[PDB]
């Protein structure tokens with residue numbers, strides 16, 4: 001039942017929350033024993049937001065490998081992503097250790113450091129060229145190379161140095177800036193173009209390790225980014241573009257990360273992001 005038609009009847013009835021709770025009721029439930037251990041109390045920004053043990057990204061170290069990061073592996077779509085929370089003052093060195101280990105090209109951010117007068121994440125990248133950051137706990141160094149500031153996003157070039165191998169790599173900061181404080185973006189137009197812009201970079205390609213995407217919790221705004229890309233990828237690919245079930249995509253993803261897609265407005269907006277993007281792939 002096509003995604004244009006469904007909506008329509010979803011509007012016609014207005015039962016977004018009603019659609020939305022059923023997915024919440026049909027979603028995966030798996031253990032999260034690692035997250036919950038006591039020595040990890042400080043690596044979680046939220047007590048109710050936890051990575052499942054079976055899909056948890058692990059940090060390459062034998063003492064403590066824990067981070068609130070999971071691997072969403074999409075079989076069909078031949079696409080992979082890591083969802084993580086906004087880093088904390090105690091996790092910064094862990095976020096970049098992850099970027100390294102995993103061999104990612106890109107870092108995507110759907111949020112500002114300050115929203116509603118309070119802190120959404122740590123300031124974790126260098127704002128000035130001659131002002132480099134060193135992550136002592138994890139022996140890496142990061143340098144701001146260049147900055148492309150535009151209306152809805154900014155793209156930054158960074159240099160990540162594994163101070164232990166002295167090897168260096170180039171990472172791309174894709175930062176979306178205009179998402180509103182309350183609600184959802186008033187028009188999917190800008191979220192989509194930024195999604196094409198991230199693909200444009202080569203960051204969501206198999207030729208690198210999965211992309212790292214985050215917002216504050218690592219489930220909401222992050223979930224729309226991946227639900228939509230994957231659905232778009234799926235439409236190009238199948239005979240029947242019409243075949244794409246957005247609820248079905250979401251529950252598959254939900255098997256790898258708890259609560260992807262936080263409110264009924266995001267579900268629909270996720271729906272308009274798919275619906276509207278199809279209109280170029282073609």
Ligand SMILES: CC(=O)N[C@@H](Cc1ccc(O)cc1)C(=O)NN
Pocket residue numbers: 011014016184185186264265266268269270272
């Ligand atoms: C008709 C309706 O329920 N609209 C939503 C708001 C909405 C707008 C754009 C989005 O992309 C997503 C959600 C609403 O009124 N919710 N209360």
